[PDB]
Amino acid sequence: VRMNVLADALKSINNAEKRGKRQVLIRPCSKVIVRFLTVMMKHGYIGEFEIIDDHRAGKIVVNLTGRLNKCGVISPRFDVQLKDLEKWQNNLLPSRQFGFIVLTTSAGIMDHEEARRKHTGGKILGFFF
Amino acid sequence: GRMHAPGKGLSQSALPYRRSVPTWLKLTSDDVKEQIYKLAKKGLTPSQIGVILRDSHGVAQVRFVTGNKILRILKSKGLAPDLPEDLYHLIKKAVAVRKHLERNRKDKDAKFRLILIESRIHRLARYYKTKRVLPPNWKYESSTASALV
Amino acid sequence: GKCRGLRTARKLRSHRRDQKWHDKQYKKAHLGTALKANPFGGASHAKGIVLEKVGVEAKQPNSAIRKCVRVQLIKNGKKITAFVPNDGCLNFIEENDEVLVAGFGRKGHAVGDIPGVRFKVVKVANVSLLALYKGKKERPR
RNA sequence: GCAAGACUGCUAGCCGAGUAGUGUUGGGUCGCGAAAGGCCUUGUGGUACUGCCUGAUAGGGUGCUUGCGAGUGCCCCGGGAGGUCUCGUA
RNA sequence: GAAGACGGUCGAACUUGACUAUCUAGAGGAAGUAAAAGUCGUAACAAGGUUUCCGUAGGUGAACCUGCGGAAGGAUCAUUA
RNA sequence: UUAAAGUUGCUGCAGUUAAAAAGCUCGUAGUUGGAUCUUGGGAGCGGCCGUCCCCUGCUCGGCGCCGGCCCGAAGCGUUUACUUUGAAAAAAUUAGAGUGUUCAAAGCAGGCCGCCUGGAUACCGCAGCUAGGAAUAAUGGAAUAGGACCGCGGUUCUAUUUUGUUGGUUUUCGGAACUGAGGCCAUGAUUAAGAGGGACGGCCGGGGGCAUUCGUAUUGCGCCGCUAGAGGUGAAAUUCUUGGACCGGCGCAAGACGGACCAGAGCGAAAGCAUUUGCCAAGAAUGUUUUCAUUAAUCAAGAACGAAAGUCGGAGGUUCGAAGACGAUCAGAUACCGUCGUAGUUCCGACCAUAAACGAUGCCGACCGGCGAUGCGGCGGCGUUAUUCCCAUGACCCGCCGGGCAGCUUCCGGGAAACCAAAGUCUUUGGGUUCCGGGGGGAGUAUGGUUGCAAAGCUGAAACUUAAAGGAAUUUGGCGAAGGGCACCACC
RNA sequence: UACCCACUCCCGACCCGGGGAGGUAGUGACGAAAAAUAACAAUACAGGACUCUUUCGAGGCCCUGUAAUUGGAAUGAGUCCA
Numbered sequence A: 001v002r003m004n005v006l007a008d009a010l011k012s013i014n015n016a017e018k019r020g021k022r023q024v025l026i027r028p029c030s031k032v033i034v035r036f037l038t039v040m041m042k043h044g045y046i047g048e049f050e051i052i053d054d055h056r057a058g059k060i061v062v063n064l065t066g067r068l069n070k071c072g073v074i075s076p077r078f079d080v081q082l083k084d085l086e087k088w089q090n091n092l093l094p095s096r097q098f099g100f101i102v103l104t105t106s107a108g109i110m111d112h113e114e115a116r117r118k119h120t121g122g123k124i125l126g127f128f129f
Numbered sequence B: 001g002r003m004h005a006p007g008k009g010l011s012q013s014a015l016p017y018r019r020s021v022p023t024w025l026k027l028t029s030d031d032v033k034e035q036i037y038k039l040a041k042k043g044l045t046p047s048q049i050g051v052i053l054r055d056s057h058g059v060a061q062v063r064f065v066t067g068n069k070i071l072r073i074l075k076s077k078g079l080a081p082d083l084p085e086d087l088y089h090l091i092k093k094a095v096a097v098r099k100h101l102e103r104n105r106k107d108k109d110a111k112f113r114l115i116l117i118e119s120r121i122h123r124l125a126r127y128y129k130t131k132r133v134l135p136p137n138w139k140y141e142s143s144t145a146s147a148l149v
Numbered sequence C: 001g002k003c004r005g006l007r008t009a010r011k012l013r014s015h016r017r018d019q020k021w022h023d024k025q026y027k028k029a030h031l032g033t034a035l036k037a038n039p040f041g042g043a044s045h046a047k048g049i050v051l052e053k054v055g056v057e058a059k060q061p062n063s064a065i066r067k068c069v070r071v072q073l074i075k076n077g078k079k080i081t082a083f084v085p086n087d088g089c090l091n092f093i094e095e096n097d098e099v100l101v102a103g104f105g106r107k108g109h110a111v112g113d114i115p116g117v118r119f120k121v122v123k124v125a126n127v128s129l130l131a132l133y134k135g136k137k138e139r140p141r
Numbered sequence D: 001g002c003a004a005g006a007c008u009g010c011u012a013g014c015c016g017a018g019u020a021g022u023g024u025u026g027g028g029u030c031g032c033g034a035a036a037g038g039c040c041u042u043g044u045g046g047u048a049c050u051g052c053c054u055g056a057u058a059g060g061g062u063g064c065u066u067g068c069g070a071g072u073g074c075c076c077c078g079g080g081a082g083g084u085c086u087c088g089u090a
Numbered sequence E: 001g002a003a004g005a006c007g008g009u010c011g012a013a014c015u016u017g018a019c020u021a022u023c024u025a026g027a028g029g030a031a032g033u034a035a036a037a038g039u040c041g042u043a044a045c046a047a048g049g050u051u052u053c054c055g056u057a058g059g060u061g062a063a064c065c066u067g068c069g070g071a072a073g074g075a076u077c078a079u080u081a
Numbered sequence F: 001u002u003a004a005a006g007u008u009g010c011u012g013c014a015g016u017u018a019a020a021a022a023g024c025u026c027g028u029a030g031u032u033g034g035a036u037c038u039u040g041g042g043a044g045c046g047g048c049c050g051u052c053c054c055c056u057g058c059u060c061g062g063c064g065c066c067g068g069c070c071c072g073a074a075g076c077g078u079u080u081a082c083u084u085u086g087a088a089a090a091a092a093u094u095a096g097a098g099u100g101u102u103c104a105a106a107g108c109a110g111g112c113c114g115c116c117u118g119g120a121u122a123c124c125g126c127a128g129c130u131a132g133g134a135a136u137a138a139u140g141g142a143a144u145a146g147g148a149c150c151g152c153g154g155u156u157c158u159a160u161u162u163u164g165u166u167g168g169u170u171u172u173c174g175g176a177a178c179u180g181a182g183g184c185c186a187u188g189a190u191u192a193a194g195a196g197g198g199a200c201g202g203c204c205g206g207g208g209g210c211a212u213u214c215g216u217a218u219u220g221c222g223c224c225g226c227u228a229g230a231g232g233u234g235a236a237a238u239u240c241u242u243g244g245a246c247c248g249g250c251g252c253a254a255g256a257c258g259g260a261c262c263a264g265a266g267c268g269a270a271a272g273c274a275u276u277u278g279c280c281a282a283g284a285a286u287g288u289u290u291u292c293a294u295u296a297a298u299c300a301a302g303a304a305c306g307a308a309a310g311u312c313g314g315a316g317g318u319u320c321g322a323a324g325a326c327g328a329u330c331a332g333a334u335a336c337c338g339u340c341g342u343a344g345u346u347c348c349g350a351c352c353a354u355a356a357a358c359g360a361u362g363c364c365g366a367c368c369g370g371c372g373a374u375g376c377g378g379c380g381g382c383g384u385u386a387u388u389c390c391c392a393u394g395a396c397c398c399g400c401c402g403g404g405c406a407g408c409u410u411c412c413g414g415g416a417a418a419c420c421a422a423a424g425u426c427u428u429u430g431g432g433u434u435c436c437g438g439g440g441g442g443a444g445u446a447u448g449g450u451u452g453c454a455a456a457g458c459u460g461a462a463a464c465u466u467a468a469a470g471g472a473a474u475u476u477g478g479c480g481a482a483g484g485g486c487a488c489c490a491c492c
Numbered sequence G: 001u002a003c004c005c006a007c008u009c010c011c012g013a014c015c016c017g018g019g020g021a022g023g024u025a026g027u028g029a030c031g032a033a034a035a036a037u038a039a040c041a042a043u044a045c046a047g048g049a050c051u052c053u054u055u056c057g058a059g060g061c062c063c064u065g066u067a068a069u070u071g072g073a074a075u076g077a078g079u080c081c082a
Helices: A005-019 A031-042 A085-091 A112-118 B029-041 B046-055 B070-077 B085-103 B108-130 C009-021 C032-037 C129-134
Strands: A023-026 A049-052 A059-063 A071-073 A100-105 A109-111 A122-128 C046-056 C066-073 C079-081 C098-101 C121-124
Touching (some): A031 A059, A109 A112
């Protein structure tokens, strides 16, 4: 039964990137997937997406480039303090020069270096590189 | 897939995109409510009310021609039965299984399906207690056949 | 872990506790039967009295006989057998002498060529076997 | 009311007529099917091809050559006559 | 205003009796381990010379054997209208 | 005793074959939970982008003011965790700035000709307290409207600043409870998940239970004509027979089982189901513009079913047949084989819960290549047959949809390999949830508990011994395996 | 089966008494920090470094090393006025 829509959708686009497709249709639509693909497009790893609107839970179709390697997820949502950000980004990021981890905060859904420069933590949501 | 059956399945309705009444139907919403009243006075279940209202007069859905659903109108007037129709059908199926098992003792599969039906009853009764429809002291025992239908 | 919930802490703690307690190297130290079975009681060295000298058999690819001295302790009076390590050192031990029995090095296992022993001898007549073998000192009489 | 196209049923003169009679499973306008007689302009040409039965030169059950497997030929009538059809042989 | 006494309370302890946990006689039988040579036969591993194995029953010096129901971890992935 | 031990796996184990999915379902605590509620407007510091102002209000008094605005404030504007700041948080020990104990481990000393001084900080998981933020799981109102808002109209109990110095009055000033009619709002219910339950119509299946009917075959009895033989093995016998064995034919009687059709076919959770007909009760699948609206797979503790054999009371006892009794193979058969033969094999009941109960691979949900058949239901299209015409029905064919047992190829990808569309989406480890195993024996053994009339089922060790026991695969070996070729030291 | 209230403190009528609280020692390889047992010369000998004799061979002042040889400069353990 479907509970975590985010993990299934990101594993779907991960398998689409691994196989070699260019468009993929993920079935559920939440706000969190819209914000995650939003910051995904902001940080330049994938192509521009389309969201189809129905009178139900909608779908998202994404145009894929070959710049992404892995689109993981963390379940459940562990809280992350600012002293413990290096603990996660040392053993989960592949390098310090790239690889970008996202955590939801009181301000919005946003990555780790912007959370460092505005000094606000929150629970962890997912990661990519 | 199914809750008790082993296999999966995919067979359900698919309402269209348009939230609009059909243009070719001039059947007034007050009149639609009047057939809902008289077919409910005939003594049917709201699934049967919906399928006959879709069938004869050819309306897409009650929710588009009106603002409510069928059971909302029935509880607005107050002639709806207090027992839910799915619980009524499941209790009637259970007492039919009990009447079948009254004469047959070695039929183990009927007893197994009886345990499954009682499990489904106990699973749905706590939801109908939780959403505050049924009284909190209501319970389905093994002997309620002359008082409960 | 198999269960990856947010609020499932002592399910996994109980599973770790049970499968840690169901080990062998962990169960060797946390049960009193192992300490009650060892005559040393967790002691490194122990004192004992020699009552006889016995020749023991050996293993299959190396056929010989080895020299084991039978040592009776003072903790419980248990009758155990030790093993004289070096060459030509059996004649220094006779009946009714105090010796310092110790371990051997495999946590109470029969080591190598000699079956049925797990301890050796370090001192005899309050002087070490190394002194009596190398001729560092002289055995008192 | 103009106005021709696309295919099609039957009869080989037309009417009697799809009339008796037949009939399937569930139906319908219902498949099949002559004739006595009349009106008489007086009744079409090229071309194949046919073992038996149920129920068309239909469909399908099934055939013959001699040991084998397959081809050839195989409705009736009149006349000329000869004498065991081929391809390879478990 | 001392000694001493009847009552109350907290009470160490004593006698009788049951019970509980550890160590130690314990006649005797039932078992496995460490090894190089003693008799019957090779039960299983190659159609182990009776295909092997698993549950449940039954007698025997011995591995073992025989019904009943399954398995292929088997020697059959297949037997021609 | 710790790291090595990714051999305790929170990060971060394994479960087909190396140790390990309860036989399979139901189910209470606990765990995990679909989508959706607010965005933008007005202008600026600058070479369109980075800093950046607003996004609930009604009494006391204040950079100010000319009856009115703003500002300071006793009084407040439902609620958890997270996140950052702040207080309170003994010292030494941990980290760490300063200085030549000559270095250093230490110590808090010490330096310029009376003065200068430092002798700090950081950390102190949780839990408790105070604050700007509402992204994330749930809480929350209004649906029989005892729903909000400005108001209209009445009943009861009480505070003083009001009524000639004064004994005394309801008032006025105003506190609280109850309360009748109407107006006012945009008057109050988001949908219908390739989640779930239920209803509807055609149908599908050795799915169940009850009652029926049929088919040979076995054995026995009764009769008929026949002859001295049926028993079995690479080899004989124990067995029955002029008291007619054996075979053929006619009839009767009992019990068992439903061959050929009978399939990598169907149903059931699993064990398991195959002669016809009738009755009852379900259940998956396809169809839906029907109904209810997050009711959701997972399962400690609890319950139903459960091959064969095992025990207990009846009915009938045909074949087969553990034990038991003989003959031969044999040196030894108490084992293979042959002849009788007990319980059991069958039903009605009453029990126990075991298998190689095995896809040796838990359940739910999604994603990632192809191909042809098969079974159900539906969606259409040539054409043939129910004889010839017209539509739908059964059958033939073409192609599609959803679920299921499956099949062929494939470095998708994985693994120790055999192999696997899962045994993949695993160091680029994280979708959720029960059970189970850390070398091999001792041993599923001692003992304790517990169910059982009985065998046993579950839970379940310790001591002691060894460095191996094990899983996949090429090559030599030998087969009381299969299939080929060779030779006058083999045969014809 | 040690010495003393002098340093740090503590009762007590109290500058002045007491304290095996403590301090000072001796034993001590629990453990930690520093740090001796060697440096200086070359004939006796294998040439690496720079140029010629194809290669042995001269200069080799820095030489990598090493043989109970030599005149040597030095400091400590310990003995020992203070």
